RNA sequence: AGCCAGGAUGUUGGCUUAGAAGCAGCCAUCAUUUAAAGAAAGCGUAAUAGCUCACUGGUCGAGUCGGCCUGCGCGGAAGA
């Protein structure tokens, strides 16, 4: 469950998220899993979507994740007046911008590598779609 | 040649004939008898030889007994007797386990006198070869 | 052997060249050499096609505009980020 | 019949019908696969 | 697309098999006769299996298959 190890600062002003994404080409392995839409990734969800694909693939190739949470969310619980000071970081989220490539892999048949990023998107709160590396 | 009449195969060895242990009670229930396993059965069984599996038709139509002309052993049964193991796989792709070369079995399968398919006998040859291989040997062709 | 036709820009900037891509066109640029570098206006689906074929990424292709002939060679392209399309093609006089 | 918002071919099998406005799958080798609404 | 045929041979495949004979198992995935036919498609026998398929002849006789950019719709949709 990815997470920073460490940080400068506890919490993050909550921000926007506008903006086109910025890692947008398969740029390690041979295929990407990339965003289509605009959102938040969690930790738990990347990890979900990993697994998934993981798994698909048994132990073979290899598998690259573009994104990494490293914004802390706070949440207020149940029965707590407005104000008194920020709430608790409950988990990490990434950003996710329309372009980015969040997964990427290597060392499979297409096929697979189309079977695998399947199954993982099914995990995922933002649309997907599976791109290949380019020349150039 | 025809279509369907009557026709199984469930042996252990020629030199164990009519058994009940390995078989039985499914020997004979449909035109064929735990008991006539032996006159048909060795009607050319003992003069040969006893240590090869082998099974054979059964041709019925409603006639008492059964009328079935025997023919040829398996190839893996002589793997046993011939070319190696007694069991044959072991960890049968771990390692190469077991071997064989291009002599043996050649002319242990260059007998069939009643079976095996294509006029060029140097190819229904290697056609026995791999019946060495499914259980993962090696090749000394 | 690879032949991409297409007009010179009469105009230039977002305006013009977001226009652009609403008609299925798209910008792209031509430089190098010692002539001053010729802005392009390529037709979409043929090039986008073209550009399937590794070759393309490799090869001199030759670029009709007017009816001149320049020679070029791929340099940088810009994709949509996440449409399989092009937004812009770098062209080397070569 | 399964009744749900995906339905889908489950074998060479199922088929895939509209019937009046809704899709339907008729299976003609397995009854569990025969389907509604999605 | 449909309909008529075939779907074989090492091999009932060796196998931590009581019995598997393609079948949860076993491991690899080779090799003969052919138009082609998978140590493998399947509902599935006490084990034989009986029966349609992947693949290929014939018949037929002109189109057929499914991804891409896209417009508008369809289901998903239960309240006093
Ligand atoms: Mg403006
Ligand atoms: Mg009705
Ligand atoms: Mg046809
Ligand atoms: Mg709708
Ligand atoms: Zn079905």
Redesign the pocket.
Same mark, same amino acid.
Do not use: H
């Given at each position: 469950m990815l997470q920073p190890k460490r940080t400068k600062f506890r919490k993050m002003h909550k921000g926007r998220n506008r903006g086109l994404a910025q890692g947008t080409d398969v740029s390690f392995g041979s295929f990407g899993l990339k965003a289509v839409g605009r959102g938040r990734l969690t930790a738990r969800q990347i990890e979900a979507a990993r697994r998934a694909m993981t798994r698909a693939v048994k132990r073979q190739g290899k598998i690259w994740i573009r994104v990494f949470p490293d914004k802390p969310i706070t949440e207020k619980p149940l029965a707590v007046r407005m104000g008194k000071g920020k709430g608790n970081v409950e988990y990490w989220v990434a950003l996710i911008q329309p372009g980015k490539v969040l997964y990427e892999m290597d060392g499979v048949p297409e096929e697979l590598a189309r079977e695998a990023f399947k199954l993982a998107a099914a995990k995922l709160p933002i649309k997907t779609t599976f791109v290949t590396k380019t020349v150039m | 040649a025809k279509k369907?009449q009557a026709?199984?195969? !469930? @042996?252990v060895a020629a030199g164990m004939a009519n058994p009940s242990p &390995?078989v039985g009670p499914?020997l004979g @229930?449909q035109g064929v008898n735990i008991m006539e396993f032996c006159k048909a059965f060795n009607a050319k069984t003992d003069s040969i030889e006893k240590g090869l599996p082998i099974?054979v038709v059964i041709t019925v139509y409603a006639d008492r007994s059964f009328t079935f002309v025997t023919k040829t052993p &398996?190839?893996?049964?002589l !793997?046993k007797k011939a070319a190696g193991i007694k /069991? $044959? /796989?072991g960890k &049968?792709?771990k390692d190469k386990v077991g071997k064989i070369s291009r002599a043996q079995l050649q002319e242990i399968a260059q007998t069939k006198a009643a %079976?095996? #398919?294509?006029a %060029?006998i140097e190819?229904?040859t =290697?056609?026995?070869?791999? #019946?060495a =291989? /499914?259980? $993962?040997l090696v090749v000394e062709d | 052997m690879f032949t991409i036709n297409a007009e010179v820009r009469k105009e230039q900037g977002k305006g013009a060249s977001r226009r652009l891509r609403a008609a299925n066109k798209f910008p792209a640029i031509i430089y190098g050499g010692k002539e001053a570098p010729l802005a392009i206006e390529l037709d979409h689906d043929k090039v986008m096609n073209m550009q399937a074929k590794a070759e393309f990424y490799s090869e001199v292709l030759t670029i009709v505009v007017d009816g001149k002939e320049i020679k070029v060679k791929a340099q940088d392209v810009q994709r949509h980020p996440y449409?399989?399309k092009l937004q812009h093609i770098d062209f080397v006089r070569a | 019949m399964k009744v749900r918002?995906?339905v889908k071919k489950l074998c060479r099998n199922c088929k895939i019908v509209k019937r009046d406005?809704?899709?339907r799958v008729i299976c003609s080798a397995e009854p569990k696969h025969k389907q509604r609404?999605?």
């Open positions: - | 369907v026709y199984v195969k !469930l @042996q &390995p499914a @229930q099974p &398996p190839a893996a049964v !793997l /069991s $044959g /796989s &049968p792709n %079976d095996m #398919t294509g %060029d190819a229904m =290697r056609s026995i070869e791999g #019946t =291989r /499914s259980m $993962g | 449409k399989p | 918002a995906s406005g809704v899709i609404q999605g």
